[PDB]
Amino acid sequence: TSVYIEDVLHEFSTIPGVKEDVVEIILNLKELVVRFLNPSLQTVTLLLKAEGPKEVKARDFLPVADVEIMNPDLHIATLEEGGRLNMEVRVDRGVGYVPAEKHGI
Amino acid sequence: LSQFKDETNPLSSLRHKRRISALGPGGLTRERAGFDVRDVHRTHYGRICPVETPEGANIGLITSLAAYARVDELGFIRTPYRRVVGGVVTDEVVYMTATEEDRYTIAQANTPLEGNRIAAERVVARRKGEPVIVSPEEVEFMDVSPKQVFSVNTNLIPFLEHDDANRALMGSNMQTQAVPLIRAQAPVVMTGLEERVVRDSLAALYAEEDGEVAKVDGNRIVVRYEDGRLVEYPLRRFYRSNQGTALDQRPRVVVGQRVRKGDLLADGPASENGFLALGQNVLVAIMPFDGYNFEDAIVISEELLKRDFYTSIHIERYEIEARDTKLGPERITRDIPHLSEAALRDLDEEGVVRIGAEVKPGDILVGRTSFKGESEPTPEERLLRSIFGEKARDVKDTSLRVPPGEGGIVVRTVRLRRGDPGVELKPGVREVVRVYVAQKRKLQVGDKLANRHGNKGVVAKILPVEDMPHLPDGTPVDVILNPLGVPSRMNLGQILETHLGLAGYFLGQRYISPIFDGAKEPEIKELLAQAFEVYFGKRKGEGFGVDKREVEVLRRAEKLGLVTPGKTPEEQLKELFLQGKVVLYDGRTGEPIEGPIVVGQMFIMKLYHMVEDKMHARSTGPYSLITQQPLGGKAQFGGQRFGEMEVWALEAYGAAHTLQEMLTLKSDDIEGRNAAYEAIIKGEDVPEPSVPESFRVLVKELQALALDVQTLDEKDNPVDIFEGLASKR
Amino acid sequence: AEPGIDKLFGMVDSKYRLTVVVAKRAQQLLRHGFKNTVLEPEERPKMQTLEGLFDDPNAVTWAMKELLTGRLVFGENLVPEDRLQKEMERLYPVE
Amino acid sequence: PQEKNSLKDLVYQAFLRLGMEKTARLLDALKYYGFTFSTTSGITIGIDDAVIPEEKKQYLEEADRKLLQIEQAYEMGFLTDRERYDQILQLWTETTEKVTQAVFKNFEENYPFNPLYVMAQSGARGNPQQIRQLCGLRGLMQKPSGETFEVPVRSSFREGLTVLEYFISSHGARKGGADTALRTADSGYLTRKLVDVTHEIVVREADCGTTNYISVPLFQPDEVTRSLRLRKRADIEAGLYGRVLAREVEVLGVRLEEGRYLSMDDVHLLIKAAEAGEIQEVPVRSPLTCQTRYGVCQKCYGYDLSMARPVSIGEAVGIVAAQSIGEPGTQLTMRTFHTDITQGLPRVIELFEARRPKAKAVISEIDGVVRIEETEEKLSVFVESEGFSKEYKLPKEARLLVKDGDYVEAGQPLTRGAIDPHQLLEAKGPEAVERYLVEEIQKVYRAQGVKLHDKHIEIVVRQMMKYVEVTDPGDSRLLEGQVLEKWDVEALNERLIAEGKTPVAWKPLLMGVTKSALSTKSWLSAASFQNTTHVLTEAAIAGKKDELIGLKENVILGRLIPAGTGSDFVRFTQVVDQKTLKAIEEARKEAVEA
Amino acid sequence: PEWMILEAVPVLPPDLRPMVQVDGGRFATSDLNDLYRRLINRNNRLKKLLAQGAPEIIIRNEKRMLQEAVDALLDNGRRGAPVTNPGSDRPLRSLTDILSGKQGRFRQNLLGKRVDYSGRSVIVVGPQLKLHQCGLPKRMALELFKPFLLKKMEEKGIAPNVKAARRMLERQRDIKDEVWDALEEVIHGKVVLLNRAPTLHRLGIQAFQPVLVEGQSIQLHPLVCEAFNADFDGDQMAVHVPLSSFAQAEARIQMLSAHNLLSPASGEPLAKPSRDIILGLYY
Amino acid sequence: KKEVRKVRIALASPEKIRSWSYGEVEKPETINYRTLKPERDGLFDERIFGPIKDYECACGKYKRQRFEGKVCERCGVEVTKSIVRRYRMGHIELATPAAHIWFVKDVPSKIG
DNA sequence: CCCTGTCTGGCGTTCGCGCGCCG
RNA sequence: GAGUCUGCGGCGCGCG
DNA sequence: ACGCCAGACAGGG
Numbered sequence A: 001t002s003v004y005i006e007d008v009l010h011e012f013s014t015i016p017g018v019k020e021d022v023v024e025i026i027l028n029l030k031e032l033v034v035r036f037l038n039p040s041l042q043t044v045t046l047l048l049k050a051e052g053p054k055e056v057k058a059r060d061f062l063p064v065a066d067v068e069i070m071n072p073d074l075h076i077a078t079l080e081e082g083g084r085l086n087m088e089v090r091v092d093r094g095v096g097y098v099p100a101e102k103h104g105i
Numbered sequence B: 001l002s003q004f005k006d007e008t009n010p011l012s013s014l015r016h017k018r019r020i021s022a023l024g025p026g027g028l029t030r031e032r033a034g035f036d037v038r039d040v041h042r043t044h045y046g047r048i049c050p051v052e053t054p055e056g057a058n059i060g061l062i063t064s065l066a067a068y069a070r071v072d073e074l075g076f077i078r079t080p081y082r083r084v085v086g087g088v089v090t091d092e093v094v095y096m097t098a099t100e101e102d103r104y105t106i107a108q109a110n111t112p113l114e115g116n117r118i119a120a121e122r123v124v125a126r127r128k129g130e131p132v133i134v135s136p137e138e139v140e141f142m143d144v145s146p147k148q149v150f151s152v153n154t155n156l157i158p159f160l161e162h163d164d165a166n167r168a169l170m171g172s173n174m175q176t177q178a179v180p181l182i183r184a185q186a187p188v189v190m191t192g193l194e195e196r197v198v199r200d201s202l203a204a205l206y207a208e209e210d211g212e213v214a215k216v217d218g219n220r221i222v223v224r225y226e227d228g229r230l231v232e233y234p235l236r237r238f239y240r241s242n243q244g245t246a247l248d249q250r251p252r253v254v255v256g257q258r259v260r261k262g263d264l265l266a267d268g269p270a271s272e273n274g275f276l277a278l279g280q281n282v283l284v285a286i287m288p289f290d291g292y293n294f295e296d297a298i299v300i301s302e303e304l305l306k307r308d309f310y311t312s313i314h315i316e317r318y319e320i321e322a323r324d325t326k327l328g329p330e331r332i333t334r335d336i337p338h339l340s341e342a343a344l345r346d347l348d349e350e351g352v353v354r355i356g357a358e359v360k361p362g363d364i365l366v367g368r369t370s371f372k373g374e375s376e377p378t379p380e381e382r383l384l385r386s387i388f389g390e391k392a393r394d395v396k397d398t399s400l401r402v403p404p405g406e407g408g409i410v411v412r413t414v415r416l417r418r419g420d421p422g423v424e425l426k427p428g429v430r431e432v433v434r435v436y437v438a439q440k441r442k443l444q445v446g447d448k449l450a451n452r453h454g455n456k457g458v459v460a461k462i463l464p465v466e467d468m469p470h471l472p473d474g475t476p477v478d479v480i481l482n483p484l485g486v487p488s489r490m491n492l493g494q495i496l497e498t499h500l501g502l503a504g505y506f507l508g509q510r511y512i513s514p515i516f517d518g519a520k521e522p523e524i525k526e527l528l529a530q531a532f533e534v535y536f537g538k539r540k541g542e543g544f545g546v547d548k549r550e551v552e553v554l555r556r557a558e559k560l561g562l563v564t565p566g567k568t569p570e571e572q573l574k575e576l577f578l579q580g581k582v583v584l585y586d587g588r589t590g591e592p593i594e595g596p597i598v599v600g601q602m603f604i605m606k607l608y609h610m611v612e613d614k615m616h617a618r619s620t621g622p623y624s625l626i627t628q629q630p631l632g633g634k635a636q637f638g639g640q641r642f643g644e645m646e647v648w649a650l651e652a653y654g655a656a657h658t659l660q661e662m663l664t665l666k667s668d669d670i671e672g673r674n675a676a677y678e679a680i681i682k683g684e685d686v687p688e689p690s691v692p693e694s695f696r697v698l699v700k701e702l703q704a705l706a707l708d709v710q711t712l713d714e715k716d717n718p719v720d721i722f723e724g725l726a727s728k729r
Numbered sequence C: 001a002e003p004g005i006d007k008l009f010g011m012v013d014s015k016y017r018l019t020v021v022v023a024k025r026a027q028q029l030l031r032h033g034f035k036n037t038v039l040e041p042e043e044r045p046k047m048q049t050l051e052g053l054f055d056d057p058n059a060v061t062w063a064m065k066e067l068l069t070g071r072l073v074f075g076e077n078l079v080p081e082d083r084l085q086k087e088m089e090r091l092y093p094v095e
Numbered sequence D: 001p002q003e004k005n006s007l008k009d010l011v012y013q014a015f016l017r018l019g020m021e022k023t024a025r026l027l028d029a030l031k032y033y034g035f036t037f038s039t040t041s042g043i044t045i046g047i048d049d050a051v052i053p054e055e056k057k058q059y060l061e062e063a064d065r066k067l068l069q070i071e072q073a074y075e076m077g078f079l080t081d082r083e084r085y086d087q088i089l090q091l092w093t094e095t096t097e098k099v100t101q102a103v104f105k106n107f108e109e110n111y112p113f114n115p116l117y118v119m120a121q122s123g124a125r126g127n128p129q130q131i132r133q134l135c136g137l138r139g140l141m142q143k144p145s146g147e148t149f150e151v152p153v154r155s156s157f158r159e160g161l162t163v164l165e166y167f168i169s170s171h172g173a174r175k176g177g178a179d180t181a182l183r184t185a186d187s188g189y190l191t192r193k194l195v196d197v198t199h200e201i202v203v204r205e206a207d208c209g210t211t212n213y214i215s216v217p218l219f220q221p222d223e224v225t226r227s228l229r230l231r232k233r234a235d236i237e238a239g240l241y242g243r244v245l246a247r248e249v250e251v252l253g254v255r256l257e258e259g260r261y262l263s264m265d266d267v268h269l270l271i272k273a274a275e276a277g278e279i280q281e282v283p284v285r286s287p288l289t290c291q292t293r294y295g296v297c298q299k300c301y302g303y304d305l306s307m308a309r310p311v312s313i314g315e316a317v318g319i320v321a322a323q324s325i326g327e328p329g330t331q332l333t334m335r336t337f338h339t340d341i342t343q344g345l346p347r348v349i350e351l352f353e354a355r356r357p358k359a360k361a362v363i364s365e366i367d368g369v370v371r372i373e374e375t376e377e378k379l380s381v382f383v384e385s386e387g388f389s390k391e392y393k394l395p396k397e398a399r400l401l402v403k404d405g406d407y408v409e410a411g412q413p414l415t416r417g418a419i420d421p422h423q424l425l426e427a428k429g430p431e432a433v434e435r436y437l438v439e440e441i442q443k444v445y446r447a448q449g450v451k452l453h454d455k456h457i458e459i460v461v462r463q464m465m466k467y468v469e470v471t472d473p474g475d476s477r478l479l480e481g482q483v484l485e486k487w488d489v490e491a492l493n494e495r496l497i498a499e500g501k502t503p504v505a506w507k508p509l510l511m512g513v514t515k516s517a518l519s520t521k522s523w524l525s526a527a528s529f530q531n532t533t534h535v536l537t538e539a540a541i542a543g544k545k546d547e548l549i550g551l552k553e554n555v556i557l558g559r560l561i562p563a564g565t566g567s568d569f570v571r572f573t574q575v576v577d578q579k580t581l582k583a584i585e586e587a588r589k590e591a592v593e594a
Numbered sequence E: 001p002e003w004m005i006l007e008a009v010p011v012l013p014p015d016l017r018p019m020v021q022v023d024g025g026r027f028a029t030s031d032l033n034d035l036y037r038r039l040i041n042r043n044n045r046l047k048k049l050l051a052q053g054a055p056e057i058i059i060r061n062e063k064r065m066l067q068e069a070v071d072a073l074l075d076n077g078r079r080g081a082p083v084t085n086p087g088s089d090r091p092l093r094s095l096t097d098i099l100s101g102k103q104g105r106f107r108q109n110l111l112g113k114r115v116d117y118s119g120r121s122v123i124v125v126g127p128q129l130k131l132h133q134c135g136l137p138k139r140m141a142l143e144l145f146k147p148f149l150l151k152k153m154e155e156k157g158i159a160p161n162v163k164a165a166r167r168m169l170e171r172q173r174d175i176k177d178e179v180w181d182a183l184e185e186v187i188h189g190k191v192v193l194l195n196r197a198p199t200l201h202r203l204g205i206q207a208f209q210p211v212l213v214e215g216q217s218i219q220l221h222p223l224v225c226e227a228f229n230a231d232f233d234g235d236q237m238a239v240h241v242p243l244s245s246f247a248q249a250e251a252r253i254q255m256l257s258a259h260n261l262l263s264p265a266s267g268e269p270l271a272k273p274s275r276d277i278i279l280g281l282y283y
Numbered sequence F: 001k002k003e004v005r006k007v008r009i010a011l012a013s014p015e016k017i018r019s020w021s022y023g024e025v026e027k028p029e030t031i032n033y034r035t036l037k038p039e040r041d042g043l044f045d046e047r048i049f050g051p052i053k054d055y056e057c058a059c060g061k062y063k064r065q066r067f068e069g070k071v072c073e074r075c076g077v078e079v080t081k082s083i084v085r086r087y088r089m090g091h092i093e094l095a096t097p098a099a100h101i102w103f104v105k106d107v108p109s110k111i112g
Numbered sequence G: 001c002c003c004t005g006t007c008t009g010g011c012g013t014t015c016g017c018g019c020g021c022c023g
Numbered sequence H: 001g002a003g004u005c006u007g008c009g010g011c012g013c014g015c016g
Numbered sequence I: 001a002c003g004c005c006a007g008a009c010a011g012g013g
């Protein structure tokens, strides 16, 4: 439902040391399929931070108690050197399709 | 002659670079002289495309050049022709002048050839603009390639051999209107120049010499060539095209990769993989829906929006300037004198809007304060200020606002203050302020899309994936095109692409069918045959056979004459599949659609959304200084023209007041429109028409000239149009 | 389409006259007060945010609804031009 | 099966039988089911769906070989360079038409439910010539100039239209592209010129009492030299539909009363009667013979308002007319200019604008008989009597069909082809010209699919003859061209009210729509098109008081329109409530003093 | 007739031929001025030439230039064409030009070309829509029926006054959902007109019942797609609004779509099933 | 308050030229840069044509609507807005006559 | 001096909308 | 108790 | 470039 890169301000920016652009990344996040186990989890914010010459996959997200990620190997990004990526990606339970413009989190 | 480069998309730019215009110095060709010039003359062969001309009053007058056409020494479009001495074809070429070409007997490239040997006694050749069946012994020269007969822009049409010249024109033109999508896919079926286009055009970034990759940033790919050298290759991250299309180079090479000379390091604004890509491949059922596709309407599946398939970034550069008035310089500050802080949030940086801020229509993009009157204060506004707070900022609110229509998010901002670096500030202009905004254009009902052949149309309804036509296997179609728009226009090429497209889907492969030499009906029947096993083969093994549905459509199909009666449904569906059509279920009912419906991968692009698309509706607004007719521009849309043609329409009808209204209350009656507004504000009945300014201005203009125009009464006596300003003193 | 436009068409000598009537009627419907109607009781004009059209939505929508009935009268010269506006103000209150 | 015509007709009927709005419901009903059934029908174009006929290969080959014979026939010296060409063209022109009915014959017999075919047969989409280019073959496409190529285009769109056959086809597309766009502005212009003269015409009346009607003809003279024939059902319907009988006519049994507006069903009766042979003409009020100087009445115009009942007074028929003529043009003026059957917009311009046509035909100024001579240089067709002959020089290029022997009435074709209005007027009179223009105008429109009511052409043509010359003065000197009715004014009061019969002898003048608009009474309307420079010069010199009548002029002022609600007939109409009718009577009762 | 001669040249008003501030200090004045100066200079220079001493050659030569000048403002081009100095070899728009032709002044009046309450967007079929109505964007409606809405806002609690109601809508993020209810109420029974690209016949314009919808596109009924020659490959139609109760009257009684089913050309209908419907009803 | 029923074009009498005329433009003085105000009597002077200001006058002796129809004792300024400026006409007294090209070059010379 | 013919001189040639540029 | 001033002529292109 | 109308002048009795 939402994402926050630490040094990024808008959706059309590019992060150094990171091949992909914020837009391509946010796109690949739509591809992320998470599975929570109970109503108590209405909105869960997944946190992830990786640095340097490493590939950022979806299993790199620090695990949360009642939530599970069935899309581990999904490719988030390719970090070069001095590649600093610290983001917070929101996740919610809903129905149908909701334009990013309709909710505006 | 020199104009704005049209860079909707790279191919557009490119085309606008080479098109030959007639109008110009004036010495050459004028505007209303042309029925002989506008025609496509014989010699236009390989020199000038006979298709690339515009639709409209200025037609046949402007045209892009051909494939290999090259201007030699003096402005003569010569065309490549290969030599053939005796019954022997050479790989030698001679760019020949328009004149010399008449001296020889040239033949077509489709001529059967074993290498250097002509293969058929009676083979086609064309003397001088005259079709002639010559012998292998007279063939003095042969054409290089069918492509040379046309332009680059046209060459890009899949099966151009099966489309009518008129709708083909619309084709080639539409491509020049293609807008770069963040997501760029190459056609499932190509012609052979998609690659060449992004290459000779400067879309993608190629590797100079062989080497390896060092760093792969989202901003730079520093490659290390094997010669001991390394170059940093910045990439135009997100730049503003003239026409507001995004131009970004997306790296396609991973870290540390030995690159071959001339391989894509990054993809241009619209390339997938070194291939020209605009709009995207999409599965399409070619059937009729309710009325959603009546004459030229298009039904889209909401599914295309789920996955950003038709999404385009649009950057607009609004700009504001701090002018120096003799009343007091117009300052740029966060202070918007009269009413709220809620409108000042996004204006975080004192005056300028904060980057990454969502700006909706009517929000302050930049703030500015000028002075209230022309030279004097206000006697009535003086008491108002004093009552609530005399101490009020005399400055007027003239702040760049988001014009009606749409704004997106603020991506970049530019401010040029007093001590200018190496900038050229116009006189009076104290300082300027640029505000780039971008927005995601999710394909909506208002947009228009069209395929390379000529099928144009607007989206009438975004259907939920829930009930649109679905294939035996859960795979649902994305767009549903109306069949009726294909017979009238003549372009079977679209129906041929769909079929080839069908095979490519289940066979998982793209193709490249040349201009006149491309794919043939048999060959496509072949691939389709290969597709039936991918489609129905897996179905056999996955565990299930044919439906009651699939069988009923077969009955109605054999009663039709699409399948030979007496063969097994397995064998019949194949025959039917080879026909390019399969069975489809309604999706809304689950029942089949009586009769096989073709389906396939058709390449469809989105056309550029001009400020003409983004609707213009006006209530009240500015007015012209000399004529008193309504006009807009910046933020007030500006009124629509009512033309004589339309006047007559009302004239026909008994719409007297409606017409009167149009000529008075709505446009020229200065006193009428004022009282009109006010009356409506109160819920009153508009006053009766005063004379229109156009009339008054007419009279005085006529008066500027000797002539005396005086209105008269029942008995020939005066009456006064100018209410009381013509009497003297 | 609209209510008995045919019926209405047949009630006049000329198409364009019906328009005049309906318009002038809708005019006086608002001006001298909107209750200047001849058929409000049992079945009358209605909108649905509530049944609130009884008071002031569309003027001529009523006019036609009236003319469709046989209560009103439209002549080339039925009642002296000035004395009508006078007698009308005297008998209809709302302002 | 329900075709666009069967349904067209159902609407029409529904309109007349049950009522307007009720019909509207019907429209939507069709609209909904036709849309739904369509989806389910699963009709879709498959490249295949375009079905090529098996006979295509035969007819092509049969015509192929025949081409050889013509070639061998020329390689010997038998056929002149020309004969060869005209002969080849003929071959394909027929062969192509053969493939045509062939393709359809295939669908008709083998594939009644073919997506493409079904769309073409149902009033949906598709044309016979178009289908031909997909399954059959688009065979002949002219060169740049106009001479059609000797080589046809053997391919279809189904199969690869080759490299060169495309280029050769481009010439025609560019020309079409250029011609089509030229027809568009030439059509709007014509509508500006059509409006420029008929704008003032508006229905404002009382049954005009001048019963001088127009007689609508049901039979036409020369298709084949001389054979009487029933005109087409369409053309005849165009002329008598919703008209008003100028006089009573008893035909097959029923009694067609006077003034009665004939319905389409009546117009059907008359034809059937004509079939039996009871009526050759039809008395009908027409704008061609109305008395109302500026404007036309209810009985002479007819039925057609947008509604099916008599025309409602105050309807801008002038424009209504002018429009019905300018729209079909844009559609048929493109083909008619393009071609044997029909010459178009250029002719429609030569028509509304009185002028001397391309191939002129010497008309017979005298009505006696025709005869012809033999001498070498120039032929000669003479209309003679034992008293005098009207010598008609017919150079080498003209062909004459009237023969040594019989009668030739005034203005009759003595040469073959087109005729000059001015001459026919002089020879056969005005009544004839009007009638000629009208039908000669419809010829073009009929031959291209458009079905416009004669009414409209009449309205305009009238204005073409709204003027006349003078040869016996009274108030103002002889050579002068003035408004015909304004002379009917002078003449009427100089003989009836004030004595001294000073006959104002005039001469009918035929003027082109353009000329009439150019030179009209008011100047305001003239200040619009021709020369604002001239128009005003004269209008000034002579203090001209533009009486405001007519919509053009009255529009510039921004004043209400003289027609419509501004229609003097309904500008004034008051509404009453029985409550206010008694209150007004109460005001009359208070008038009794003491 | 003694007036045909000019001894007094009328000058056109000051504002009409605009002396305006352009940019940075650039000034734009109507061409007529340049011609007027010509005349003024000539006449003056003549007077002085006669008063100084008058050598025959030079008095005529001037009166000549004078004569031509006088032609210039009246009509340019009838004899030679005056030009603004090296910049644009363009005919200074003389009085004659201003009055004649295509986009002249006699044509600006006649065709009256710019409506205050107008709109124009792309059209899109609206299959469920009835001939009676049309789909008009609410966003479009808002501006179109702004004044009509402002008042309606005050009749309810959405806004205190007009000016209040105005600022309330100046920004898009400020619109209370209550406003749409107001507008939806304002257009209750009013109707607007729709215009097609070339207005060829009276049906080139028709009146429909606006049914406010979301988005940019304007929903047009399919049956009327034949009246206006309009397909949906992107054709755009304009839209107007009848302001007086009279204008609305005529517009919904005689100009509405549904009431004009038959064509003025022929007694044939123009609401016949089209390309799609016939295909369905045939099969 | 009457209805305009007839319009009429008529030639111009030199006296009528002057009669529609307010003031006489006797000098080629457009507007002098320092002050974007009309220079002298020239083409844009406000007397000859009209109030450069709303309801206010020249010097400001009378400045609102109460006395809308009177002229300033020390300065001649009657006022409404500046529309009077766009409706007023001026005349140029030509030395030696010249003729209308409209009457002279029309195909039929109305004068010839 | 008359009538006839020939080059000659003036006007017109859809509508609306977008965008962008320029003194 | 709100209202001024700018956007013109032309050119190019593109849509229906 | 064209087409079209309307025109004013010059040549052959």
Ligand SMILES: CNC(=O)[C@@H](C)[C@H]1C(=O)/C(=C(O)/C=C/C(C)=C/[C@@H](C)[C@H]2O[C@@]3(C)O[C@H](C=C[C@@]34CO4)[C@@H]2C)C(=O)N1[C@@H]1CC[C@H](O)[C@H](C)O1
Residues within 6 Å of the ligand: B031, B032, B033, B034, B035, B056, B057, B058, B059, D177, D178, D179, D180, D181, D182, D183, D185, D186, D345, D346, D347, D349, G013, I002, I003
């Ligand atoms: C009334 N007119 C007619 O129909 C007939 C009579 C006559 C005529 O008057 C013609 C023309 O006036 C043609 C004008 C041209 C070529 C206009 C261009 C400038 C057009 O080009 C484009 C660029 O712009 C506009 C419109 C469309 C265009 C093509 O895209 C524009 C108008 C014409 O074609 N005729 C034929 C000729 C051959 C021969 O001599 C024959 C006897 O008569």
Ligand SMILES: Nc1ncnc2c1ncn2[C@@H]1O[C@H](COP(=O)(O)CP(=O)(O)OP(=O)(O)O)[C@@H](O)[C@H]1O
Residues within 6 Å of the ligand: B056, B057, B488, B489, D181, D184, E197, E198, E229, H016
């Ligand atoms: N120059 C122009 N002037 C006026 N209208 C134009 C135009 N160009 C296009 N159009 C309008 O838009 C339409 C475009 O023409 P087309 O659709 O090609 C004609 P068509 O013969 O109907 O082809 P089609 O039936 O195969 O669709 C016309 O009906 C016309 O009204």
Ligand SMILES: [Mg+2]
Residues within 6 Å of the ligand: E230, E231, E232, E233, E234, E235, H016
């Ligand atoms: Mg279209």
Ligand SMILES: [Mg+2]
Residues within 6 Å of the ligand: E231
């Ligand atoms: Mg079309």
Ligand SMILES: [Zn+2]
Residues within 6 Å of the ligand: D207, D208, D285, D289, D290, D291, D292, D296, D297, D298, D299, D300, D301
């Ligand atoms: Zn009559």
Ligand SMILES: [Zn+2]
Residues within 6 Å of the ligand: F057, F058, F059, F060, F061, F062, F072, F074, F075, F077
């Ligand atoms: Zn003063």
